[PDB]
Amino acid sequence: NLYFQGHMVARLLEEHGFETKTNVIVQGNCVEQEIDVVAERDGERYMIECKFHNIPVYTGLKEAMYTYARFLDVEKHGFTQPWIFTNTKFSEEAKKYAGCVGIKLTGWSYPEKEGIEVLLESKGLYPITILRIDKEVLDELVRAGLVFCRDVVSAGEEKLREIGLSAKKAREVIAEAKKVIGGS
Amino acid sequence: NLYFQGHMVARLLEEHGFETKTNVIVQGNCVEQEIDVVAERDGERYMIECKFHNIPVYTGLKEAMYTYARFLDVEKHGFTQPWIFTNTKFSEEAKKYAGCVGIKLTGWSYPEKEGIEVLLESKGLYPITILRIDKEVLDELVRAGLVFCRDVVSAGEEKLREIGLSAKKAREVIAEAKKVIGGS
Ligand SMILES: [Cl-]
Ligand SMILES: [Cl-]
The CATH number that applies at residue A116 is 3.40.1350.10
Q: Report how many Cβ contacts below 8 Å link chain A to chain B.
A: 40
Residues A85 and A120 in one domain: yes
Say if residue A1 is in the same domain as residue A77: yes
Which residues of chain A lie closer than 8 angstroms to B29, CB-CB? 100
Examine the fold and report which residue of B125, B141, B170 is the final residue of a domain before the chain moves on.
Answer: B125
CATH number of the domain bearing residue B151: 1.10.150.20
Q: Are residues A30 and A68 in the same domain?
A: yes
Which residue out of A67, A68, A90, A105 would a mutagenesis test of the B interface target, given it has the greatest number of B Cβ atoms within 10 Å? Answer: A68
Does residue B167 sit at the A interface (CB-CB below 8 Å)? no
User: Which of B107, B125, B143 is the endpoint of a domain?
Assistant: B125
B156 with B78, same domain? no
The verdict on B131 and B105 lying in the same domain is no
Give the full edge-to-edge strand order of the sheet including B44-50. B19-27, B32-41, B44-50, B81-85, B104-106
DSSP string, chain B: -HHHHHHHHHHHHHTTT-EEEEEEEEE-SSSEEEEEEEEEETTEEEEEEE---SSS-EE-HHHHHHHHHHHHHHGGGT-SEEEEE-SSEE-HHHHHHHHHHT-EEE-SS-STT-SHHHHHHTTT--BGGGSS--HHHHHHHHHTT--BHHHHHHHHHHHHHHTT--HHHHHHHHHHHHHHHH--
- Are residues B148 and B105 part of one domain? no
Whether B151 and B84 map to the same domain: the answer is no
For residue A130, the enclosing domain spans 126-184
CA distance A113 to chain B (A): 25
Query: Is A147 found in the same domain as A106?
Result: no
Shortest CA distance to A107 belongs to which of A95, A97, A99?
Answer: A95
Q: Are B110 and B168 members of one domain?
A: no
Q: How was this structure determined?
A: X-ray
B133 shares its domain with B107? no
What resolution in angstroms, rounded to 1 decimal? Answer: 1.9
**Do B42 and B117 reside in the same domain of the chain?**
yes
Task: Collect all residues with Cβ–Cβ distance below 8 Å to A170 and sequence separation of at least 6.
Answer: A157, A160, A161
Provide the terminal-to-terminal Cα distance of chain B, rounded to the nearest Å: 25
Residues of B in contact with A30 (CB under 8 A): 96-97, 100-101
User: Domain count of chain A?
Assistant: 2
CA distance B65 to A71: 10
- Same domain, residue pair B71 and B2: yes
Region of residue A154 (left: phi > 0; alpha: psi -120 to 50; beta: else): alpha
Residue at which a domain ends, from A125, A146, A167 = A125
CA A55 to chain centre: 17
CA A40 – CA A112 distance, rounded (Å) = 22
Ligand nearest to the CA of A150: 1
Contact B29 A100 (CB under 8 A): yes
